[PDB]
Amino acid sequence: DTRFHSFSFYELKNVTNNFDERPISVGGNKMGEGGFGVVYKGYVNNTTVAVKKLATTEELKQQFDQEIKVMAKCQHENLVELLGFSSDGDDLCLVYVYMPNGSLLDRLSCLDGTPPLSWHMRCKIAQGAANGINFLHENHHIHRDIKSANILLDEAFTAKISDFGLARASEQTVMTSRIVGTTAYMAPEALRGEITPKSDIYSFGVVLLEIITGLPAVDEHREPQLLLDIKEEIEDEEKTIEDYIDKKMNDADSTSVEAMYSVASQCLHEKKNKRPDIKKVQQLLQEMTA
Ligand SMILES: O=c1[nH]c(NC2CC2)nc(N[C@@H]2C[C@H](CO)[C@@H](O)[C@H]2O)c1-c1nc2ccccc2s1
Numbered sequence: 001d002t003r004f005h006s007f008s009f010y011e012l013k014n015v016t017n018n019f020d021e022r023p024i025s026v027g028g029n030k031m032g033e034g035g036f037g038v039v040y041k042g043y044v045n046n047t048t049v050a051v052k053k054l055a056t057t058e059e060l061k062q063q064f065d066q067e068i069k070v071m072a073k074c075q076h077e078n079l080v081e082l083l084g085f086s087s088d089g090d091d092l093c094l095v096y097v098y099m100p101n102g103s104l105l106d107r108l109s110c111l112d113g114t115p116p117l118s119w120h121m122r123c124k125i126a127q128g129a130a131n132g133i134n135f136l137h138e139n140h141h142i143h144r145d146i147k148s149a150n151i152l153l154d155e156a157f158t159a160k161i162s163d164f165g166l167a168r169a170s171e172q173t174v175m176t177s178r179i180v181g182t183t184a185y186m187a188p189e190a191l192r193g194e195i196t197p198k199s200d201i202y203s204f205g206v207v208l209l210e211i212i213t214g215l216p217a218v219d220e221h222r223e224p225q226l227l228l229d230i231k232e233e234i235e236d237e238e239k240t241i242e243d244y245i246d247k248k249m250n251d252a253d254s255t256s257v258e259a260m261y262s263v264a265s266q267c268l269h270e271k272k273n274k275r276p277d278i279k280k281v282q283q284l285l286q287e288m289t290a
Contacts, residue, residue, distance in 0.1 A: 002072040004082060007044065009089020012051050015042035019053055025112070031102070034149060035163045036063050037094075044095070049083065052094040063165035064092045070164040074139055078132030080152055080162040099160060101153035104129075104207070108148060108214050108246075116248035119256070121157050122211045126260060127285045128159030133204060134278045136161070137197050140170040144195070146203035147185045147217070148210050168195055184217035184226055189272050198272040201281065205267025208260055214246030231268050234261075259288040 013019060019040055022028020031039040037054040054060050064085070071082040086093035101107060104125060107117055117125070129151050136143055143150075144166040152160040166180050174195040181190055187202035206217050209227050217227045224230065233239045241261045245252055263284045269275045276284070 002075060004068065004072070005084030005095075006088075007084045007086045007093065007095055009086045009091070009093065011044065012042060012053075012086055012093050012095070013089070015044050015049075016040040016051050036060060036165055041098070042095075047083075048098040050096045050098050052096070054092040054094070061092065064094070066167060067094060067164045070141060070167045074136060074141065074164075076132060076135040078128045078159055078161060079135065080160045096162075099152040099162075100155050101157055103149050104151040104153060104159070104210070105148035105216070107153060108210055109216065110248070116214070116246070117157070119249050119252035122249075123256065123260070123285075123289050125151070125153070125157065125159045126208060126211055127282075127289070129161065129204070129207065130278065130282045130285050132159065132161035133200055134282050136167075137200070137278045142168045142170060142195060142197050143200050143203075144168060144190075145181050145185075146200050146207060147182050148207055151207065170197065172196075182217070184228075187272065188270055194272075196272060197278070198275050201267050201275045201278060202269075202272075204281065205264045208264035208267065209244075212241065212246065212257060212260060212264070213244045214248055215244075228268055231265055234265075256288050260285070263288070 016029045020028035021030050023030060024041060029040040031041055031050060035052065037052045040051045040053065042049045042051045054064055068085055081097040083095045083097060085095065107114060110116055133146065143161065145163055150161065150163045152162050154160060175193045176195055179191065179193055185203040185206045187199040189196065190199035206228055209230060210217060215227055219225060230244055234241055241258060242254065245257055263281055266276050267281065
């Protein structure tokens with residue numbers, strides 16, 4: 001129930017300086033890649049924008065149409081806002097409201113010298129991302145790729161879920177022959193082909209451990225290589241959550257950290273049916289602050 005502006009490919013190509021692959025530091029427009037396309041910076045109709053140039057040529061178009069369909073239905077403060085698209089020119093384009101603070105992944109890794117996020121900001125981001133996932137679930141949508149690189153941050157560090165190309169509708173448990181997502185964030189059933197909102201909750205649990213630790217979901221040069229495994233180290237009493245807390249924080253209290261960890265631990269239950277639903281995750285995150 002939302003109609004979008006149709007942008008000219010050449011208006012987008014013009015404003016993004018002919019889709020420059022160079023970073024913003026040197027003089028280019030490229031903001032990043034991974035979402036089956038490349039994101040560029042632009043200025044259109046008196047507003048700063050993000051332009052996603054998509055990007056089988058038919059499978060990429062499916063990822064383009066589904067994103068428009070999901071964004072036409074799903075409008076929430078904790079979701080990215082689509083302004084319009086482009087189909088006329090060579091490549092397919094998606095135009096969104098610009099997210100000045102980029103991704104949660106980049107802000108947890110302090111990429112390009114940006115200051116570390118305070119525990120106060122992290123609690124707000126976790127609550128915001130949970131409100132975004134709740135909105136999608138209440139509206140019978142499964143994201144299928146909940147990860148820190150897909151949680152974007154605005155002018156006020158408000159969390160905004162992005163990338164709905166792989167999203168699926170509900171309004172059970174479906175199965176698929178095309179297993180999509182990011183392995184390090186994926187639930188056991190999702191890696192096996194199942195399609196359930198319960199898998200989105202698991203992925204969110206990995207995101208909460210990233211928020212607490214400031215560690216990426218997967219690191220080749222690390223023990224354990226997968227962040228989700230720390231849950232076992234803490235459960236076996238070999239280590240504690242306090243040993244994993246991001247040292248790049250001066251405002252993190254033990255009570256709220258443990259309260260967030262408890263939510264992440266519950267989210268990361270290997271049995272899909274034992275996991276809390278998004279409404280419970282939302283409640284618990286609110287109770288943590290309050
Ligand atoms: O509006 C944006 N601003 C910034 N950067 C500001 C200068 C800081 N980066 C974005 N994406 C990149 C995605 C990537 C992780 O893979 C990171 O490297 C991010 O930088 C977007 C959007 N990306 C998307 C993607 C889908 C929907 C909406 C948007 S808006």
